[PDB]
Amino acid sequence: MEHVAFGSEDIENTLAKMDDGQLDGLAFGAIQLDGDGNILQYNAAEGDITGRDPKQVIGKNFFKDVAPCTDSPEFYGKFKEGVASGNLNTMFEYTFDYQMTPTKVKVHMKKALSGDSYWVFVKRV
Numbered sequence: 001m002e003h004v005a006f007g008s009e010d011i012e013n014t015l016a017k018m019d020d021g022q023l024d025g026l027a028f029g030a031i032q033l034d035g036d037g038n039i040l041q042y043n044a045a046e047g048d049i050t051g052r053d054p055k056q057v058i059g060k061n062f063f064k065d066v067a068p069c070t071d072s073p074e075f076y077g078k079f080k081e082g083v084a085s086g087n088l089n090t091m092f093e094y095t096f097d098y099q100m101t102p103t104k105v106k107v108h109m110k111k112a113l114s115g116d117s118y119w120v121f122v123k124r125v
């Protein structure tokens, strides 16, 4: 296990040291996105929540292909605004219901320490 708590003030700092191996040790889902919504990293906890296979969704667009239920002003709109502004830090509850049993989650989106990368963090509620 990688002891990092969900919602940690300095989470972008802590996770800049991890490779996909270490990311898989998190107590929660973590997705890394580029500015366009493309998946750069997808960890095993997220796979456990959504039933997706990590390696199969890497390189796919999250809002277009993988998760259309987040293609909405309540999710994707917050993301596109963060990317445009170059700052992002927001936490909100959401239901994931695409090709899966509807599953209520807590989502935290935050800009990574690195230029054009963005984190999506997910835990069950």
Ligand SMILES: *C(=O)/C=C\c1ccc(O)cc1
Pocket (backbone or CB within 6 Å): 031, 046, 050, 052, 066, 067, 068, 069, 070, 095, 096, 097, 098, 100
């Ligand atoms: C809604 O679009 C629910 C599905 C879903 C699939 C994968 C990930 O990572 C998040 C949400």
